[PDB]
């Protein structure tokens, strides 16, 4: 099976994310569990947890279908001790909120080095940030998202994800999410099926499909290898529809949240339906 949705708004409460995913007929969704531009939030109440779990059950969303995203403030590779520890505290908190809400995955961008430490030292700080969070929680997998590679952000090479995974000690609770816009911006071509196979053969050899826990399905307003992170609606950008035809037919993308982060949410329902229809058996 494939699970297909979008990063929907949590405005008004977390249960509203499940309701909004249902309104666009998604079979997966993403959300922020708290304000993505703040370091902390009110503790979850038993009421808020209960309302959120009841909505997930009502609308047929198990934890295997939900891919929360961490905040924009967290840098798990930060070169300054105080800021690294602030980020590790907030990331632990994000993982704890996920456990309390019945979730099992947490998608995050890995970190950035600010040109103050080497890439390899930054990657090792990120791995150890994951190790700390995993030692303090249960049941939640740290899902590293690849990036476009703006500024001093890492995660734009598959080798970055693999170097982090190598430093994580409990490999049963680490994985990756491939964002197609980020990969294209970073120079992994996706414009034909043959280029998709090339790119994911590189992914297989460096990271491994063993670790694939989600996808973000985004076309790209930016150009090939621009290293600029700007999404587009599926098939309106520089990737085109073919990569998403190919993903929907390939079984290496089964069983995981496939999450739209496309720029026009008024056509999310259309995009979800288009993705689902690709799975219908077509005559010769
Ligand atoms: Cl980036
Ligand atoms: Cl292009
Ligand atoms: Fe993404
Ligand atoms: Ni129903
Ligand atoms: Zn992201
Ligand atoms: Zn992006």
Respond yes or no: is residue 160 known to be catalytic: no
Residue 178 in tokens: 């491939």
Residue 211 in tokens: 């670790």
Residue 105 three-state SS? strand
Cα(57) to ligand 4 centroid in Å equals: 9
Cα(284) to ligand 1 centroid in Å equals: 42
The conformation of residue 65, written as its DSSP 8-state character, comes to: G
Respond yes or no: is residue 245 known to be catalytic: no
Partners of 69 in beta bridges: 107
What's the CA gap between 50 and 102, in Å, rounded?
10
The 141-145 sheet, strands edge to edge: 28-30, 3-7, 257-260, 212-217, 174-179, 141-145, 105-108
| Cα–Cα separations (whole angstroms), residue 143 to 9, 106, 130, 140, 257 | 20, 5, 10, 9, 12
What's the CA gap between 159 and 212, in Å, rounded?
14
Instruction: Answer whether 250's CB lies under 8 Å from 258's CB.
Output: no
What's the CA gap between 231 and 180, in Å, rounded?
9
Give the position of tokens 């990271």.
207
* Among 93, 94, 179, 195, the one annotated catalytic: 179
b/e 68-88 (16+ beta carbons within 10 angstroms → b)? bbbbebbbbbbbeeeebebbb
Angle at CA of residue 208, ends 26 and 181, nearest 5°: 50
Find the radius of gyration of the CA atoms of the chain: 18
Q: Where do the structural domains in the chain lie, given as residue ranges?
A: 1-284
- The conformational region for residue 86 under phi > 0 = left, psi -120 to 50 = alpha, else beta, is alpha
Respond yes or no: is residue 261 known to be catalytic: yes
PDB experimental method: X-ray
The two most distant CA atoms of the chain are separated, in Å, by: 62
CATH class of 1-284: alpha beta
Question: CB neighbours of 41 closer than 8 A, spacing ≥ 6?
Answer: 34, 35
Residue 142 three-state SS? strand
Instruction: Answer whether 55's CB lies under 8 Å from 102's CB.
Output: no
Q: Where are the beta strands (DSSP E) in 149-272?
A: 174-179, 212-217, 219-220, 231-232, 257-260
């Amino acid at each position: 099976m494939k699970y297909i949705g979008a990063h929907v708004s949590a405005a008004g409460g977390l249960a509203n994310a499940a309701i909004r995913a249902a309104e666009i007929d998604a079979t997966a969704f993403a959300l922020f569990t708290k304000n993505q531009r703040q370091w902390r939030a009110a503790p979850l109440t038993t009421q808020t947890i209960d309302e959120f779990k009841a909505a997930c059950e009502k609308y047929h969303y198990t934890s295997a279908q939900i891919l929360p995203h961490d905040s924009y403030l967290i840098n798990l590779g930060h070169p300054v001790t105080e800021a690294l520890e602030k980020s590790r505290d907030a990331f632990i908190d994000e993982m704890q909120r996920c456990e309390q809400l019945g979730l099992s995955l947490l998608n995050f961008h890995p970190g950035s080095h600010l040109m103050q430490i080497s890439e390899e030292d930054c990657l090792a700080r990120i791995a150890e940030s994951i190790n700390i969070a995993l030692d303090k929680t249960q049941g939640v997998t740290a899902v590293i998202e690849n990036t476009a590679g703006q500024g001093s952000n890492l995660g734009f090479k598959f080798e970055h994800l693999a170097a982090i995974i190598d430093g994580v000690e409990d490999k049963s609770r680490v994985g990756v999410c491939i964002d197609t816009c980020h990969a294209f911006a970073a120079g992994y071509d996706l414009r034909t099926p043959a280029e998709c196979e090339k790119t994911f053969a590189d992914f297989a050899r460096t990271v491994g499909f063993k670790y694939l826990r989600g996808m973000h399905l985004n076309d790209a307003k930016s150009t090939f290898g621009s290293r600029v992170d700007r999404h587009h609606s599926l098939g309106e950008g520089n990737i085109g529809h073919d990569a998403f035809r190919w993903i929907m037919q390939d079984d290496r993308f089964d069983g995981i949240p496939l999450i739209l982060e496309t720029i026009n949410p008024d056509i999310w329902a259309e995009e979800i339906a288009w993705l689902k229809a690709q799975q219908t058996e077509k005559a010769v």
